[PDB]
C-alpha cells in the first residue's frame, strides 16, 4: 500500500561508457518509467504500462524540463568546482526529488543533492528550510533560503502535483506493480575439509521483499548464516542466496526457510 515517485538527475564533468554527461530518470515504486539523456536529448518512456497512458504533449513537457535541467547541471558543476577550489577532472553532481504515499495515507516530499557522492544540501518542504550537509554547502543554503517564491513552488509541487501524478501512475501500473511471482528454491551443498557449505537460492520472486533463513532442528541459525543482498533478474523479478557451514555428519538437521508474499505458508527445503 505505500508508493513512491522519484526523479534522479545526474551530471558528470567527464562522461564515459554508460555514463552520459546528463541523465534524468523517473521511478514509480522503484520501477523505471522514463529516461532522458544528453545523447538522445529527449525524454521517453521505459515501461509500456506508462507509455500506454501518456501522450506526445506529456513527453514534450518532460523533454523541455530535462533540457532545462541539463543546462543548469553544466553551470552547477562549474560553480561547485570553483566552490571547492578543485582542478578540472572527474566530478559528479546529483539531485533526487519526489514524493511518497505512506501506509497511513500520509505523504513525504524529497529534494536532496549530492556532490562527489556525498550529501551536499537538502530541502525540507514542511519548514521551507535548506540543510547544508557539508560546510561548502552553507553558501548555497544562504543563497537558496532568500528564494522564497521558488521554495513555495517546490513545496506546492511536492505536496500536490507530485502526489496527484503518483496516484495516477500507480493506477496505470496496477497489473505489473501488484503481480506476485513465487520463488523457485534450490538447495546445494559443497564439502571441502570436514566443512559442508549449504547454499539456498531463491529465484524469480516478485515483489522484492523476502525472508530467507537456515534452521538446525527447526531453530534459526542467524549468527551462522551468510546472506546476499536481494538482486534483480532481467525480467524485474529477484534473486537471493543464504549459506551456512555445518558438520557434514549433521547435514540432516538443516533446512532453508523462505517466506514471501506469493507463498501461502513458509517454504522449507532440504538438500
Amino acid at each position: 500500500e505505500p508508493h513512491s515517485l522519484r526523479y534522479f538527475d545526474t551530471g558528470v564533468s567527464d562522461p564515459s561508457p554508460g555514463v552520459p554527461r546528463f541523465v534524468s530518470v523517473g521511478y514509480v515504486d522503484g520501477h523505471l518509467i522514463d529516461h532522458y539523456d544528453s545523447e538522445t536529448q529527449r525524454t521517453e518512456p521505459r515501461a509500456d504500462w506508462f507509455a500506454a497512458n501518456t501522450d506526445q504533449q506529456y513527453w514534450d513537457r518532460q523533454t523541455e524540463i530535462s533540457r532545462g535541467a541539463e543546462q543548469i547541471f553544466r553551470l552547477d558543476l562549474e560553480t561547485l568546482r570553483e566552490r571547492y577550489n578543485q582542478s578540472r577532472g572527474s566530478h559528479t553532481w546529483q539531485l533526487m526529488y519526489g514524493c511518497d504515499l505512506l501506509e497511513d495515507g500520509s505523504t513525504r516530499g524529497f529534494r536532496q543533492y549530492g556532490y562527489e557522492g556525498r550529501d551536499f544540501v537538502a530541502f525540507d518542504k514542511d519548514t521551507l528550510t535548506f540543510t547544508a550537509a557539508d560546510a561548502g554547502a552553507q553558501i548555497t543554503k544562504r543563497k537558496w533560503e532568500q528564494e522564497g517564491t521558488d521554495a513555495e513552488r517546490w513545496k506546492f509541487y511536492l505536496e500536490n502535483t507530485c502526489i496527484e501524478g503518483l496516484r495516477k501512475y500507480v493506477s496505470y501500473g496496477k497489473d505489473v506493480l501488484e503481480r506476485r511471482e513465487r520463488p523457485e528454491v534450490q538447495v546445494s551443498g559443497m564439502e571441502a575439509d570436514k566443512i559442508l557449505t549449504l547454499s539456498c537460492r531463491a529465484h524469480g520472486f516478485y515483489p522484492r521483499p523476502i525472508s530467507i533463513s537456515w534452521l538446525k532442528d527447526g531453530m534459526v541459525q542467524e549468527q551462522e548464516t551468510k546472506r546476499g543482498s536481494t538482486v534483480p533478474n532481467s525480467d524485474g523479478t529477484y534473486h537471493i542466496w543464504a549459506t551456512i557451514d555445518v558438520l557434514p555428519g549433521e547435514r540432516d538437521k538443516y533446512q532453508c526457510r523462505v517466506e514471501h508474499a506469493s507463498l501461502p505458508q513458509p517454504g522449507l527445503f532440504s538438500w
Partner: peptide, 9 residues
C-alpha cells in the same frame, strides 16, 4: 511528472 528547476548554485 517532473518539476522545473529554476535556480542555479
Amino acid at each position: 511528472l517532473r518539476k522545473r528547476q529554476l535556480t542555479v548554485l
